[PDB]
C-alpha cells in the first residue's frame, strides 16, 4: 500500500530519477519555462522551489550546497544573482504549471512549467 507516502517513482530507480531531475531543474532555471509531462513536472515544483528559497539568502555554505545539488556553477550563480532578489518578497509558489493538450508521440498529459515572473 501507499498510506501517507510521497515521491513519485516515474518507473525509474533513485539514481536515474535524481539525475534526470537535476538536469530538469538546471534547464528550468536557465530558460524560465520548459514543457514536460504533468506528473514529471509536479515533482519539479517540489524540487526547485526549496532551491529558490535556499538561494534567497547569499552565503558560502548555501552556495556550496546549491552547487552540490545542481552540479553547475553557472546555474548556481544565475540562481543566486537573479532569482533570489526577484522572489525575495514572495512567500512560496515560485512556479506555475499550465496544461497544454497531449503529446502526439505517446498521448501523455503535458504542461508548461514556468516561473511566476517570466515576463
Amino acid at each position: 500500500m501507499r498510506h501517507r507516502k510521497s515521491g513519485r517513482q516515474l518507473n525509474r530507480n533513485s539514481s536515474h530519477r535524481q539525475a534526470m531531475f537535476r538536469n530538469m531543474a538546471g534547464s528550468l532555471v536557465r530558460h524560465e519555462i520548459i514543457k514536460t509531462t504533468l506528473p514529471k513536472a509536479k515533482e519539479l515544483r517540489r524540487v526547485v522551489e526549496p532551491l529558490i528559497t535556499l538561494a534567497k539568502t547569499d552565503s558560502v555554505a548555501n552556495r556550496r550546497l546549491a552547487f552540490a545539488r545542481t552540479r553547475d556553477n553557472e546555474i548556481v550563480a544565475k540562481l543566486f544573482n537573479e532569482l533570489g532578489p526577484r522572489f525575495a518578497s514572495r512567500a512560496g509558489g515560485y512556479t506555475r504549471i499550465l496544461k497544454c493538450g497531449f503529446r502526439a508521440g505517446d498521448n501523455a498529459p503535458m504542461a508548461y512549467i514556468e516561473l511566476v515572473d517570466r515576463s
Binding site: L98, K99, C100, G101, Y112, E114, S119
Partner: peptide, 18 residues
C-alpha cells in the same frame, strides 16, 4: 479544453505563451 490553454497560448484572458 477546460483547465487547459488554447492552441495560440491564451488561458483565462491574459496570454501566457507569447
Amino acid at each position: 479544453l477546460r483547465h487547459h490553454i488554447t492552441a495560440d497560448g491564451y488561458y483565462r484572458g491574459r496570454k501566457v505563451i507569447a
